[PDB]
């Protein structure tokens, strides 16, 4: 539909700006950074409102959701049978953050990757957009699906090689986007032990949900990146559990799991998607954010459920309707660390993002500067979903039957701009 989504992401003065400039432009940076050692206090914080609101940011879901999807598929595929967490949010903001400190050319393929890329036919030149725009758009996603920053909250740390300067503009974008941001520096000489001094550091703030964050930090390194996203609901509010109990999960055909299951019979928004072997089952997970869940057909592999999602969302969307369902649903909640670099590496496009033919000179005045690990944290927190509430019951109505006991894809979307904030698939409830 909407055609062009740089034009909402760029001055109204669009300029060709020259890719390789025979001068460079001078770099704002800061230095010192606050030293990790002895700082646990949140970075502190400093606006002019955004004024097409409802479009950008209804423009940058489609965006991000392409993107999540894409980066969800190819993640998927190399874990089959392991629980997968990816969330859309945080890593198209992880990429935009990064895209300040990029060289011109290295930030044209941001762009690409994005979808925020105006074609010329023209080489020397090229059209960039404004990232604190992208990225003040994506806390407005965000933020809008609770100002409280409880259902949701995101945190963005930056740690840099101690000797190292860091840009101004990359410092605005880790506050663009993130609830809260710490960037501190550190000497990664002895790197074992700066390893465990920022894991410990991200555990002090935050949780103690991952505890080793970052792995093979080396005495070279230039600067580790690593966002979080925090949902949080409620099963007894959200899916209204009339009876619990302990239930056979599949994740193999011959391995079961007993786990907490939930059961509810009343309508819900369903579809039983007979030539794709699907069912997808619509359910409110707060005010403003619902979740979907796609079961295949017994008999059916779930890889082969997954490998239209790309696409299919939308069809699946455009055709649930109400059906009377006792539908059963493990209680599960889910962790995940999202390595960025590993997953566009298996995209093919890491070599020119991160890689051998990535430039961060827009970054820092350190030579050679590297952004060296990209991580989300995501967590899945939902509350309860254990007891048991009352029932109304049509009585003269056969409900039917879904059972979420084998495994499933599913995704969390708030439902102003139709964002997915984090998307997953479950091999095993409890593991």
């Known amino acids: 539909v909407y055609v062009h989504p740089f034009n909402l992401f760029s001055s109204e003065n669009i300029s060709c700006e020259v890719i390789q400039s025979e001068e460079h432009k001078p770099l704002e940076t800061v230095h010192p950074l606050p030293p990790l050692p002895g700082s646990t206090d949140p970075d502190p914080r400093t606006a002019e409102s955004l004024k097409n609101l409802t479009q950008r940011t209804a423009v940058l879901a489609e965006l991000q959701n392409s993107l999540g999807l894409r980066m969800y598929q190819t993640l998927s595929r190399t874990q089959k049978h392991t629980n997968t967490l990816l969330?859309?949010?945080?890593?198209?903001?992880?990429?935009?953050?990064?895209?300040?400190?990029?060289?011109?050319?290295?930030?044209?393929?941001?762009?690409?990757?994005?979808?925020?890329?105006?074609?010329?036919?023209?080489?020397d030149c090229a059209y960039f957009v404004d990232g604190h725009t992208v990225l003040r758009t994506l806390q407005a996603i965000s933020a809008h699906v609770d100002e409280?920053?409880?259902?949701?909250?995101?945190?963005?740390?930056?740690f840099v090689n101690s000797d190292a300067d860091l840009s101004k503009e990359f410092?605005?974008?880790?506050?663009?986007?993130?609830?809260?941001?710490?960037?501190?520096?550190?000497?990664?000489?002895?790197?074992?032990?700066?390893?465990?001094?920022?894991?410990?550091?991200?555990?002090?703030?935050?949780?103690?949900?991952?505890?080793?964050?970052?792995?093979g930090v080396t005495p070279k390194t230039d600067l580790l990146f690593a966002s979080s996203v925090h949902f949080k609901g409620n099963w007894k509010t959200a899916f209204q559990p009339e009876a619990t109990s302990d239930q056979d999960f599949w994740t193999q055909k011959n391995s079961s799991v007993q786990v907490p299951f939930m059961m509810h019979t009343g309508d819900y928004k369903y579809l039983d998607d007979a030539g794709r072997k699907c069912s997808i089952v619509r359910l409110g997970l707060s005010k403003r954010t619902?979740?979907?869940?796609?079961?295949?057909?017994?008999?059916?592999?779930?890889?082969?459920?997954?490998?239209?999602?790309?696409?299919?969302?939308?069809?699946?969307?455009?055709?649930?309707?109400?059906?009377?369902?006792?539908?059963?649903?493990?209680?599960?909640?889910?962790?995940?660390?999202t390595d960025l670099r590993s997953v566009l590496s298996e995209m093919?496009?890491?070599?020119?993002?991160?890689?051998?033919?990535?430039?961060?000179?827009?970054?820092?005045?350190?030579?050679?500067?590297?952004?060296?690990?990209?991580?989300n944290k995501v967590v899945f927190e939902m509350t309860e979903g254990g007891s048991e509430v009352q029932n109304r019951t049509d009585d003269g109505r056969a409900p039917h039957?879904?059972?979420?006991?084998?495994?499933?894809?599913?995704?969390?979307?708030?439902?102003?701009?139709?964002?997915?904030?984090?998307?997953?698939?479950?091999?095993?409830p409890t593991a």
């Open 148 to 158: 409280s920053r409880k259902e949701l909250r995101t945190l963005v740390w930056t």
């Open 87 to 123: 969330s859309p949010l945080n890593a198209f903001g992880a990429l935009v953050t990064l895209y300040l400190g990029a060289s011109k050319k290295t930030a044209i393929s941001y762009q690409q990757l994005l979808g925020l890329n105006l074609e010329s036919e023209q080489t």
């Open 348 to 375: 093919a496009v890491e070599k020119y993002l991160m890689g051998s033919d990535a430039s961060f000179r827009r970054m820092s005045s350190k030579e050679n500067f590297t952004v060296d690990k990209v991580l």
């Open 290 to 337: 619902f979740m979907l869940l796609v079961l295949p057909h017994e008999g059916a592999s779930l890889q082969d459920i997954e490998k239209p999602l790309l696409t299919v969302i939308p069809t699946w969307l455009r055709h649930l309707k109400e059906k009377y369902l006792e539908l059963s649903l493990p209680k599960f909640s889910l962790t995940a660390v």
């Open 401 to 428: 039957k879904v059972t979420f006991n084998r495994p499933f894809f599913f995704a969390v979307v708030e439902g102003n701009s139709n964002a997915i904030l984090m998307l997953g698939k479950i091999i095993n």
């Open 171 to 215: 410092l605005r974008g880790t506050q663009d986007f993130s609830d809260d941001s710490f960037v501190r520096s550190v000497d990664f000489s002895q790197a074992k032990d700066a390893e465990v001094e920022v894991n410990n550091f991200i555990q002090k703030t935050s949780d103690n949900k991952v505890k080793s964050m970052f792995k």
